Amino acid sequence: PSGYGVLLATHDDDTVDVFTSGRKMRLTCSPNIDAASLKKGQTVRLNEALTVVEAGTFEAVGEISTLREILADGHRALVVGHADEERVVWLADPLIAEDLPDTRPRKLRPGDSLLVDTKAGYAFERIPKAVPDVSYADIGGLSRQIEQIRDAVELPFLHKELYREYSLRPPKGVLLYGPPGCGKTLIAKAVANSLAKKMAEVRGDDAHEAKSYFLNIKGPELLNKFVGETERHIRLIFQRAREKASEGTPVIVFFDEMDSIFVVPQLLSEIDGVEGLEVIVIGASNREDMIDPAILRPGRLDVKIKIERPDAEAAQDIYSKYLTEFLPVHADDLAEFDGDRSACIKAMIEKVVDRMYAEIDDNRFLEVTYANGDKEVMYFKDFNSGAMIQNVVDRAKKNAIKSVLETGQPGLRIQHLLDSIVDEFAENEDLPNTTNPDDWARISGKKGERIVYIRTLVTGKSSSASRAIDTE
Amino acid sequence: PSGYGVLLATHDDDTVDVFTSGRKMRLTCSPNIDAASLKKGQTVRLNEALTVVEAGTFEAVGEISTLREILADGHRALVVGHADEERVVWLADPLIAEDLPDTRPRKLRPGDSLLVDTKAGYAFERIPPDVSYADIGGLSRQIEQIRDAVELPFLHKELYREYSLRPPKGVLLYGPPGCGKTLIAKAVANSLAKKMAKSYFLNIKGPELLNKFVGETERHIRLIFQRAREKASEGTPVIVFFDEMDSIFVVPQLLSEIDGVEGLENVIVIGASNREDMIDPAILRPGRLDVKIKIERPDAEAAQDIYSKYLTEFLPVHADDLAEFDGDRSACIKAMIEKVVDRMYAEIDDNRFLEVTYANGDKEVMYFKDFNSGAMIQNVVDRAKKNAIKSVLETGQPGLRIQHLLDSIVDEFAENEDLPNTTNPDDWARISGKKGERIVYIRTLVTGKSSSASRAIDTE
């Protein structure tokens, strides 16, 4: 029958201060044990004669207090508990151990949760709780976009030496803005994949690959708490970034829906912290007006690259991307083009593109009434997007499969594609959620007048109904 | 086996007041230990016979309470925890030691976090600039107005005294963005940091007003000012810069804290704000921010002065441009600088920026020459340097040429037309004032040759 205690201080005369069942009783050590090998904060054992009889491990359960500061002497730890109370506690041997390098054992920094025992004023241990394949070629209709992206991202990280010679710092951030339906995540993944490839560990190809270095977070996951509230994870994400920074395979911090973010101030400091580092920050937004210019000033997000709506040629490129030679193009289409699938898919694509982008009454999208009484008719060519093209391709695929199930003939046709186009056009007319206030801002800037009324124009041959739209 | 205790008081009959376990008492002292050298708060140890046999050190861990009042006799401190409760505790010998001057202990004052023992009632230990006026271009009047109010009183205290003129306490920097307006504050804090005829450097920003991190931000306003007065009792100057006051303008703590440092002229309080409309006039009243200094949009000559900084003779100016000026680097750079500045400030239709429609029906067309800024100049310089780097890469020859800057100018203008965050309501205030009519509609215009699109501007 023997009790336990916590070692406080080791003295040369074999006497050891032990905190046990009260305030700091000092006892004597048994000859069996060595007082030199004992550790501060290590749970010790006491017999009935109040003599330290054996050593042991450290206490594993107790109160959890986050570490605020290490303060003076490097050992005593300033921690705060649940009630915002401030306490100074020693750090046990495992915490102050110099064998911990940079979930896994590590040193202690502010924000970490330490297992503490307030009775002994000790901290014992830390309790941690807590890549793209797409390339530039896989994204169609964004040539000048990817050119600017390369000149702003790839060019500095390769030609740092020329940048230093001309005294030009590498841009720290890339701002991507434009209507939805295209880019945002796609471009953000493509640029990082192209980066990781370009070099590809310049050395022996027989030991070098495309490698993997990427990271994605989104603006919506700010108010989400679960494990921890909004403010805390903003340091951890950039610590994750700097972890791969020195490894020579940098990742990119990507902000999706950054317009929804703007509390602001910590992001400024955390972005400025990676200034002297080459990791890039990419921001994506579908509405640029409310975005604070503080983060757009030179030095944080220097290159602002607009992801505009696709035109006719961009639509042709995206349809080439979405309509590969592996798709079952119908024999009726193939026969007209001498069985040449390459010249049949391309002719199919140009047919559907001209059908969509032709200014016809069936392609009328919406009517804008301005503050001066002017009414301007908008067409589906002015509101095309990669998402709309993808939806048309998928719905034409579904139409082709449904036609297969009924007629027995495999293949996708101009009939299927045009039916998909008109069906998706009617679907947008009935539910036009693609548009954003930036589209109305651009329309108002082009017109020269304010926008006071918007209504959708329906062809009248589908179940879609005309519906008014409010900008505010 | 021996006990431990905390020394409370020393008595002449060798008995010592000692706090240990429960039932605190006073004990007879062993002849080995001397009662004269014993000090308050020192943790002593006692044998089973309840006799103090050794005088040890002070307790190094415990509760942390922020000091509130250093109180009169014996300096027994009134301290508070975060539970909003006040406690009166004794101060140990090291805290009341008179050997400390103003990771090392200095003279204690309210706001310091002290390591206290609640049950004992004893506190043992306390728990804790390279830019000049020359680098800034195009702000000669602003730097002069700054120095006349900040440096001039400090150097000529006696002449200010002779005219019964009080030195102004703080300055107010206001105007449209793009010039930064923090460089001016740093330049004055540095040029005044070298007098001795380093002195000082410190900064803090308004945006971290709602941010908390360590502790709550409610009393941070008093902490920053006590850190400011720390060296204010030394004789070296202080300049408390407050960037982005327009975000702050709760208010009253700053008003009281600026008044609390009024009587000590050794401290300056500088403020910056991109829009002066909502700044509380109480902080602009004489005595708090006496002189108000406006950082406005640079003109053509200010642009040339700024470009002289960004385009130095050490930059690789192309040999094609060098040969035009007989290899003269300085003359070539001066000529290319004035060329690009004249290009930006030309009233050609390609230098058009925005269209504003007024409430009276008039529409005014205004150019990029009215929205030049240090940020736009620097972005043009950086893009021209990138164009030069690209040239070297695809053509072989080195050098930055006038064509690179001109292309950078037009690209930056197109980028501004597409993305109009360089404009603030401060600009529209001056525009509507000079027009004489309210502004109802602002929209971007595009020359049509770029990928930029016209966008309606609605600012607030």
Side-chain angles (χ1 to χ4, degrees), chain A residues 99-135:
Chain A
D99 306 312
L100 311 168
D102 292 332
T103 315
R104 298 312 149 194
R106 191 184 173 91
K107 59 176 181 180
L108 314 180
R109 45 194 166 196
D112 292 337
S113 299
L114 304 178
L115 161 79
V116 293
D117 202 352
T118 54
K119 62 94 174 179
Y122 279 172
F124 286 160
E125 59 187 358
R126 179 171 53 74
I127 315 296
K129 42 176 190 179
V131 294
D133 193 316
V134 58
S135 58

mmCIF file of all heavy atoms in Angstrom, chain A residues 99-135:
data_model
loop_
_atom_site.group_PDB
_atom_site.id
_atom_site.type_symbol
_atom_site.label_atom_id
_atom_site.label_comp_id
_atom_site.label_asym_id
_atom_site.label_seq_id
_atom_site.Cartn_x
_atom_site.Cartn_y
_atom_site.Cartn_z
ATOM 1 N N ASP A 99 14.694 17.044 -28.332
ATOM 2 C CA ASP A 99 14.704 16.002 -29.350
ATOM 3 C C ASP A 99 13.471 16.033 -30.243
ATOM 4 O O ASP A 99 13.357 15.194 -31.143
ATOM 5 C CB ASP A 99 14.827 14.624 -28.692
ATOM 6 C CG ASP A 99 16.015 14.531 -27.755
ATOM 7 O OD1 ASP A 99 17.124 14.941 -28.156
ATOM 8 O OD2 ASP A 99 15.839 14.046 -26.617
ATOM 9 N N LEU A 100 12.550 16.971 -30.020
ATOM 10 C CA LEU A 100 11.349 17.069 -30.834
ATOM 11 C C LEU A 100 11.617 17.974 -32.023
ATOM 12 O O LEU A 100 11.855 19.177 -31.831
ATOM 13 C CB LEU A 100 10.185 17.612 -30.011
ATOM 14 C CG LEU A 100 9.942 16.957 -28.651
ATOM 15 C CD1 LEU A 100 8.966 17.781 -27.826
ATOM 16 C CD2 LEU A 100 9.437 15.532 -28.822
ATOM 17 N N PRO A 101 11.593 17.458 -33.252
ATOM 18 C CA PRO A 101 11.846 18.315 -34.415
ATOM 19 C C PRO A 101 10.585 18.996 -34.916
ATOM 20 O O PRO A 101 9.508 18.836 -34.332
ATOM 21 C CB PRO A 101 12.402 17.330 -35.448
ATOM 22 C CG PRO A 101 11.690 16.051 -35.131
ATOM 23 C CD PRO A 101 11.434 16.044 -33.635
ATOM 24 N N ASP A 102 10.707 19.756 -35.999
ATOM 25 C CA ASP A 102 9.556 20.413 -36.601
ATOM 26 C C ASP A 102 8.879 19.493 -37.610
ATOM 27 O O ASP A 102 7.891 18.829 -37.294
ATOM 28 C CB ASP A 102 9.973 21.722 -37.274
ATOM 29 C CG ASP A 102 10.412 22.774 -36.277
ATOM 30 O OD1 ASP A 102 9.934 22.740 -35.123
ATOM 31 O OD2 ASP A 102 11.235 23.639 -36.646
ATOM 32 N N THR A 103 -0.383 16.283 -34.398
ATOM 33 C CA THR A 103 -0.617 14.849 -34.530
ATOM 34 C C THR A 103 0.620 14.060 -34.116
ATOM 35 O O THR A 103 0.519 12.994 -33.511
ATOM 36 C CB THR A 103 -1.003 14.473 -35.972
ATOM 37 O OG1 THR A 103 -1.979 15.398 -36.466
ATOM 38 C CG2 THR A 103 -1.579 13.066 -36.020
ATOM 39 N N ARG A 104 1.787 14.600 -34.444
ATOM 40 C CA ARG A 104 3.075 13.997 -34.154
ATOM 41 C C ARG A 104 3.867 14.893 -33.211
ATOM 42 O O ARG A 104 3.592 16.096 -33.112
ATOM 43 C CB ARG A 104 3.862 13.755 -35.451
ATOM 44 C CG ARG A 104 3.164 12.800 -36.405
ATOM 45 C CD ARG A 104 2.699 11.554 -35.664
ATOM 46 N NE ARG A 104 1.482 10.987 -36.232
ATOM 47 C CZ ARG A 104 0.725 10.083 -35.626
ATOM 48 N NH1 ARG A 104 1.031 9.618 -34.426
ATOM 49 N NH2 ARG A 104 -0.367 9.634 -36.239
ATOM 50 N N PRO A 105 4.840 14.339 -32.485
ATOM 51 C CA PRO A 105 5.587 15.147 -31.513
ATOM 52 C C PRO A 105 6.231 16.366 -32.156
ATOM 53 O O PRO A 105 6.815 16.292 -33.238
ATOM 54 C CB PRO A 105 6.642 14.169 -30.974
ATOM 55 C CG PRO A 105 6.614 12.986 -31.903
ATOM 56 C CD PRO A 105 5.220 12.920 -32.416
ATOM 57 N N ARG A 106 6.116 17.500 -31.470
ATOM 58 C CA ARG A 106 6.631 18.773 -31.951
ATOM 59 C C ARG A 106 6.851 19.668 -30.736
ATOM 60 O O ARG A 106 6.488 19.314 -29.611
ATOM 61 C CB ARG A 106 5.661 19.386 -32.973
ATOM 62 C CG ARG A 106 6.210 20.576 -33.749
ATOM 63 C CD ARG A 106 5.166 21.187 -34.668
ATOM 64 N NE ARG A 106 5.662 22.412 -35.282
ATOM 65 C CZ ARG A 106 6.298 22.464 -36.444
ATOM 66 N NH1 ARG A 106 6.471 21.383 -37.186
ATOM 67 N NH2 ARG A 106 6.767 23.631 -36.876
ATOM 68 N N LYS A 107 7.447 20.835 -30.961
ATOM 69 C CA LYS A 107 7.612 21.839 -29.925
ATOM 70 C C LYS A 107 6.268 22.507 -29.642
ATOM 71 O O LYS A 107 5.243 22.190 -30.249
ATOM 72 C CB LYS A 107 8.674 22.857 -30.341
ATOM 73 C CG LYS A 107 8.356 23.587 -31.635
ATOM 74 C CD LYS A 107 9.400 24.649 -31.939
ATOM 75 C CE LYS A 107 9.073 25.389 -33.227
ATOM 76 N NZ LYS A 107 10.091 26.429 -33.541
ATOM 77 N N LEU A 108 6.276 23.450 -28.706
ATOM 78 C CA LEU A 108 5.062 24.111 -28.246
ATOM 79 C C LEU A 108 5.038 25.553 -28.733
ATOM 80 O O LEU A 108 6.055 26.251 -28.673
ATOM 81 C CB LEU A 108 4.961 24.066 -26.720
ATOM 82 C CG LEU A 108 5.259 22.721 -26.058
ATOM 83 C CD1 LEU A 108 5.119 22.834 -24.549
ATOM 84 C CD2 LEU A 108 4.343 21.641 -26.610
ATOM 85 N N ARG A 109 3.881 25.988 -29.212
ATOM 86 C CA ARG A 109 3.668 27.341 -29.698
ATOM 87 C C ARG A 109 2.312 27.821 -29.209
ATOM 88 O O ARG A 109 1.471 27.011 -28.805
ATOM 89 C CB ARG A 109 3.736 27.409 -31.230
ATOM 90 C CG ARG A 109 2.969 26.316 -31.945
ATOM 91 C CD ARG A 109 3.382 26.258 -33.400
ATOM 92 N NE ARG A 109 2.930 25.040 -34.061
ATOM 93 C CZ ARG A 109 3.408 24.607 -35.218
ATOM 94 N NH1 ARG A 109 4.372 25.255 -35.850
ATOM 95 N NH2 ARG A 109 2.909 23.497 -35.753
ATOM 96 N N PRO A 110 2.078 29.134 -29.210
ATOM 97 C CA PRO A 110 0.770 29.650 -28.787
ATOM 98 C C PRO A 110 -0.362 29.064 -29.619
ATOM 99 O O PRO A 110 -0.232 28.856 -30.827
ATOM 100 C CB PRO A 110 0.904 31.160 -29.005
ATOM 101 C CG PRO A 110 2.356 31.426 -28.839
ATOM 102 C CD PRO A 110 3.065 30.217 -29.384
ATOM 103 N N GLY A 111 -1.484 28.797 -28.954
ATOM 104 C CA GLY A 111 -2.635 28.179 -29.569
ATOM 105 C C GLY A 111 -2.744 26.686 -29.333
ATOM 106 O O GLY A 111 -3.832 26.124 -29.506
ATOM 107 N N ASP A 112 -1.651 26.035 -28.947
ATOM 108 C CA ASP A 112 -1.685 24.610 -28.666
ATOM 109 C C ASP A 112 -2.317 24.341 -27.306
ATOM 110 O O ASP A 112 -2.180 25.126 -26.364
ATOM 111 C CB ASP A 112 -0.274 24.024 -28.707
ATOM 112 C CG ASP A 112 0.318 24.026 -30.100
ATOM 113 O OD1 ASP A 112 -0.457 24.058 -31.079
ATOM 114 O OD2 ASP A 112 1.561 23.990 -30.216
ATOM 115 N N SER A 113 -3.012 23.212 -27.208
ATOM 116 C CA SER A 113 -3.645 22.784 -25.969
ATOM 117 C C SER A 113 -2.710 21.840 -25.227
ATOM 118 O O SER A 113 -2.281 20.821 -25.779
ATOM 119 C CB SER A 113 -4.982 22.097 -26.247
ATOM 120 O OG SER A 113 -5.885 22.979 -26.892
ATOM 121 N N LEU A 114 -2.398 22.180 -23.980
ATOM 122 C CA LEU A 114 -1.506 21.387 -23.152
ATOM 123 C C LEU A 114 -2.283 20.762 -22.003
ATOM 124 O O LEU A 114 -3.158 21.396 -21.405
ATOM 125 C CB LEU A 114 -0.358 22.234 -22.587
ATOM 126 C CG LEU A 114 0.524 23.000 -23.573
ATOM 127 C CD1 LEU A 114 1.561 23.821 -22.822
ATOM 128 C CD2 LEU A 114 1.195 22.047 -24.546
ATOM 129 N N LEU A 115 -1.954 19.511 -21.699
ATOM 130 C CA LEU A 115 -2.505 18.834 -20.535
ATOM 131 C C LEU A 115 -1.802 19.372 -19.295
ATOM 132 O O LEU A 115 -0.578 19.257 -19.171
ATOM 133 C CB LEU A 115 -2.330 17.320 -20.641
ATOM 134 C CG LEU A 115 -2.458 16.584 -19.307
ATOM 135 C CD1 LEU A 115 -3.922 16.419 -18.935
ATOM 136 C CD2 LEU A 115 -1.760 15.242 -19.360
ATOM 137 N N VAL A 116 -2.574 19.960 -18.383
ATOM 138 C CA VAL A 116 -2.015 20.631 -17.221
ATOM 139 C C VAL A 116 -2.681 20.099 -15.961
ATOM 140 O O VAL A 116 -3.810 19.606 -15.981
ATOM 141 C CB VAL A 116 -2.177 22.165 -17.299
ATOM 142 C CG1 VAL A 116 -1.338 22.735 -18.431
ATOM 143 C CG2 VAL A 116 -3.641 22.535 -17.470
ATOM 144 N N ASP A 117 -1.951 20.203 -14.855
ATOM 145 C CA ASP A 117 -2.465 19.898 -13.526
ATOM 146 C C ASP A 117 -2.223 21.128 -12.660
ATOM 147 O O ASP A 117 -1.089 21.387 -12.245
ATOM 148 C CB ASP A 117 -1.793 18.659 -12.941
ATOM 149 C CG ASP A 117 -2.629 18.001 -11.862
ATOM 150 O OD1 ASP A 117 -3.653 18.592 -11.462
ATOM 151 O OD2 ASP A 117 -2.262 16.896 -11.416
ATOM 152 N N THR A 118 -3.290 21.885 -12.395
ATOM 153 C CA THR A 118 -3.154 23.157 -11.697
ATOM 154 C C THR A 118 -2.681 22.992 -10.259
ATOM 155 O O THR A 118 -2.084 23.926 -9.711
ATOM 156 C CB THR A 118 -4.483 23.913 -11.718
ATOM 157 O OG1 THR A 118 -5.520 23.073 -11.196
ATOM 158 C CG2 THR A 118 -4.838 24.325 -13.139
ATOM 159 N N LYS A 119 -2.934 21.839 -9.638
ATOM 160 C CA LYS A 119 -2.488 21.629 -8.264
ATOM 161 C C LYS A 119 -0.965 21.631 -8.171
ATOM 162 O O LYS A 119 -0.394 22.201 -7.236
ATOM 163 C CB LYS A 119 -3.091 20.331 -7.706
ATOM 164 C CG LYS A 119 -2.694 19.037 -8.416
ATOM 165 C CD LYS A 119 -1.497 18.366 -7.759
ATOM 166 C CE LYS A 119 -1.195 17.015 -8.384
ATOM 167 N NZ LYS A 119 -0.010 16.371 -7.754
ATOM 168 N N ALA A 120 -0.292 21.012 -9.140
ATOM 169 C CA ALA A 120 1.162 21.025 -9.190
ATOM 170 C C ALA A 120 1.715 22.155 -10.047
ATOM 171 O O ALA A 120 2.935 22.359 -10.061
ATOM 172 C CB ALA A 120 1.686 19.684 -9.717
ATOM 173 N N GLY A 121 0.857 22.893 -10.747
ATOM 174 C CA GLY A 121 1.307 23.954 -11.626
ATOM 175 C C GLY A 121 2.208 23.440 -12.729
ATOM 176 O O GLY A 121 3.262 24.021 -13.000
ATOM 177 N N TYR A 122 1.801 22.345 -13.371
ATOM 178 C CA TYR A 122 2.624 21.664 -14.356
ATOM 179 C C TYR A 122 1.858 21.480 -15.658
ATOM 180 O O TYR A 122 0.634 21.339 -15.672
ATOM 181 C CB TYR A 122 3.094 20.294 -13.844
ATOM 182 C CG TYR A 122 4.289 20.367 -12.933
ATOM 183 C CD1 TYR A 122 4.744 19.248 -12.250
ATOM 184 C CD2 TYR A 122 4.970 21.559 -12.758
ATOM 185 C CE1 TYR A 122 5.842 19.323 -11.418
ATOM 186 C CE2 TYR A 122 6.059 21.641 -11.932
ATOM 187 C CZ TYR A 122 6.494 20.527 -11.268
ATOM 188 O OH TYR A 122 7.589 20.639 -10.452
ATOM 189 N N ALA A 123 2.608 21.487 -16.756
ATOM 190 C CA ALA A 123 2.109 21.111 -18.071
ATOM 191 C C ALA A 123 2.899 19.901 -18.544
ATOM 192 O O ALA A 123 4.134 19.921 -18.535
ATOM 193 C CB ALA A 123 2.235 22.264 -19.069
ATOM 194 N N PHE A 124 2.189 18.851 -18.953
ATOM 195 C CA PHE A 124 2.804 17.553 -19.201
ATOM 196 C C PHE A 124 2.919 17.208 -20.678
ATOM 197 O O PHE A 124 3.979 16.760 -21.124
ATOM 198 C CB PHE A 124 2.010 16.460 -18.472
ATOM 199 C CG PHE A 124 2.233 16.446 -16.988
ATOM 200 C CD1 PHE A 124 1.326 15.834 -16.141
ATOM 201 C CD2 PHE A 124 3.349 17.056 -16.440
ATOM 202 C CE1 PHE A 124 1.532 15.827 -14.774
ATOM 203 C CE2 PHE A 124 3.559 17.051 -15.077
ATOM 204 C CZ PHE A 124 2.648 16.436 -14.242
ATOM 205 N N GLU A 125 1.854 17.396 -21.454
ATOM 206 C CA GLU A 125 1.853 16.986 -22.849
ATOM 207 C C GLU A 125 0.887 17.847 -23.646
ATOM 208 O O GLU A 125 -0.003 18.495 -23.088
ATOM 209 C CB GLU A 125 1.477 15.506 -22.993
ATOM 210 C CG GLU A 125 0.110 15.171 -22.432
ATOM 211 C CD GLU A 125 -0.168 13.684 -22.425
ATOM 212 O OE1 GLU A 125 0.697 12.911 -22.887
ATOM 213 O OE2 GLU A 125 -1.252 13.288 -21.950
ATOM 214 N N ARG A 126 1.076 17.841 -24.961
ATOM 215 C CA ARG A 126 0.238 18.584 -25.891
ATOM 216 C C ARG A 126 -0.767 17.641 -26.539
ATOM 217 O O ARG A 126 -0.428 16.512 -26.903
ATOM 218 C CB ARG A 126 1.095 19.263 -26.961
ATOM 219 C CG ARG A 126 0.313 20.050 -27.995
ATOM 220 C CD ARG A 126 1.252 20.852 -28.883
ATOM 221 N NE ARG A 126 2.293 20.023 -29.481
ATOM 222 C CZ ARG A 126 2.096 19.168 -30.475
ATOM 223 N NH1 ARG A 126 0.904 19.009 -31.025
ATOM 224 N NH2 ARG A 126 3.123 18.458 -30.932
ATOM 225 N N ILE A 127 -2.003 18.109 -26.677
ATOM 226 C CA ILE A 127 -3.088 17.312 -27.237
ATOM 227 C C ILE A 127 -3.480 17.932 -28.577
ATOM 228 O O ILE A 127 -4.237 18.913 -28.608
ATOM 229 C CB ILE A 127 -4.289 17.239 -26.286
ATOM 230 C CG1 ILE A 127 -3.820 16.964 -24.857
ATOM 231 C CG2 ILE A 127 -5.268 16.169 -26.745
ATOM 232 C CD1 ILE A 127 -3.145 15.621 -24.681
ATOM 233 N N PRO A 128 -2.997 17.404 -29.699
ATOM 234 C CA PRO A 128 -3.443 17.905 -31.003
ATOM 235 C C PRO A 128 -4.741 17.240 -31.435
ATOM 236 O O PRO A 128 -4.887 16.017 -31.384
ATOM 237 C CB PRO A 128 -2.285 17.530 -31.933
ATOM 238 C CG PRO A 128 -1.722 16.286 -31.321
ATOM 239 C CD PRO A 128 -1.921 16.403 -29.826
ATOM 240 N N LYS A 129 -5.694 18.067 -31.859
ATOM 241 C CA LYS A 129 -6.999 17.564 -32.270
ATOM 242 C C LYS A 129 -7.258 17.835 -33.747
ATOM 243 O O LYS A 129 -7.640 16.923 -34.489
ATOM 244 C CB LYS A 129 -8.103 18.179 -31.404
ATOM 245 C CG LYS A 129 -7.933 19.664 -31.129
ATOM 246 C CD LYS A 129 -9.115 20.215 -30.352
ATOM 247 C CE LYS A 129 -9.070 21.732 -30.281
ATOM 248 N NZ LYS A 129 -10.240 22.285 -29.546
ATOM 249 N N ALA A 130 -7.050 19.078 -34.177
ATOM 250 C CA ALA A 130 -7.268 19.492 -35.563
ATOM 251 C C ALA A 130 -8.675 19.148 -36.043
ATOM 252 O O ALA A 130 -9.264 19.872 -36.844
ATOM 253 C CB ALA A 130 -6.224 18.862 -36.478
ATOM 254 N N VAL A 131 -4.564 17.185 -54.740
ATOM 255 C CA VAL A 131 -3.624 17.581 -55.780
ATOM 256 C C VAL A 131 -4.253 17.369 -57.156
ATOM 257 O O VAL A 131 -5.015 16.424 -57.359
ATOM 258 C CB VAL A 131 -2.294 16.821 -55.641
ATOM 259 C CG1 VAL A 131 -1.599 17.224 -54.349
ATOM 260 C CG2 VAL A 131 -2.529 15.318 -55.678
ATOM 261 N N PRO A 132 -3.944 18.255 -58.098
ATOM 262 C CA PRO A 132 -4.653 18.251 -59.377
ATOM 263 C C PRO A 132 -3.961 17.416 -60.442
ATOM 264 O O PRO A 132 -2.734 17.304 -60.492
ATOM 265 C CB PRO A 132 -4.653 19.732 -59.766
ATOM 266 C CG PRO A 132 -3.350 20.235 -59.214
ATOM 267 C CD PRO A 132 -3.010 19.391 -58.002
ATOM 268 N N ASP A 133 -4.787 16.828 -61.304
ATOM 269 C CA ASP A 133 -4.333 16.190 -62.531
ATOM 270 C C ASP A 133 -4.617 17.058 -63.752
ATOM 271 O O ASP A 133 -3.885 16.973 -64.743
ATOM 272 C CB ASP A 133 -5.009 14.812 -62.676
ATOM 273 C CG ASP A 133 -4.371 13.928 -63.747
ATOM 274 O OD1 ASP A 133 -4.060 14.408 -64.855
ATOM 275 O OD2 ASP A 133 -4.203 12.718 -63.482
ATOM 276 N N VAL A 134 -5.626 17.925 -63.675
ATOM 277 C CA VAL A 134 -6.014 18.789 -64.785
ATOM 278 C C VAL A 134 -4.857 19.711 -65.149
ATOM 279 O O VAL A 134 -4.160 20.244 -64.278
ATOM 280 C CB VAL A 134 -7.282 19.587 -64.424
ATOM 281 C CG1 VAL A 134 -7.064 20.416 -63.163
ATOM 282 C CG2 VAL A 134 -7.716 20.475 -65.584
ATOM 283 N N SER A 135 -4.640 19.880 -66.449
ATOM 284 C CA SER A 135 -3.619 20.771 -66.973
ATOM 285 C C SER A 135 -4.285 21.921 -67.715
ATOM 286 O O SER A 135 -5.512 22.042 -67.747
ATOM 287 C CB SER A 135 -2.654 20.027 -67.905
ATOM 288 O OG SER A 135 -3.351 19.420 -68.979
#
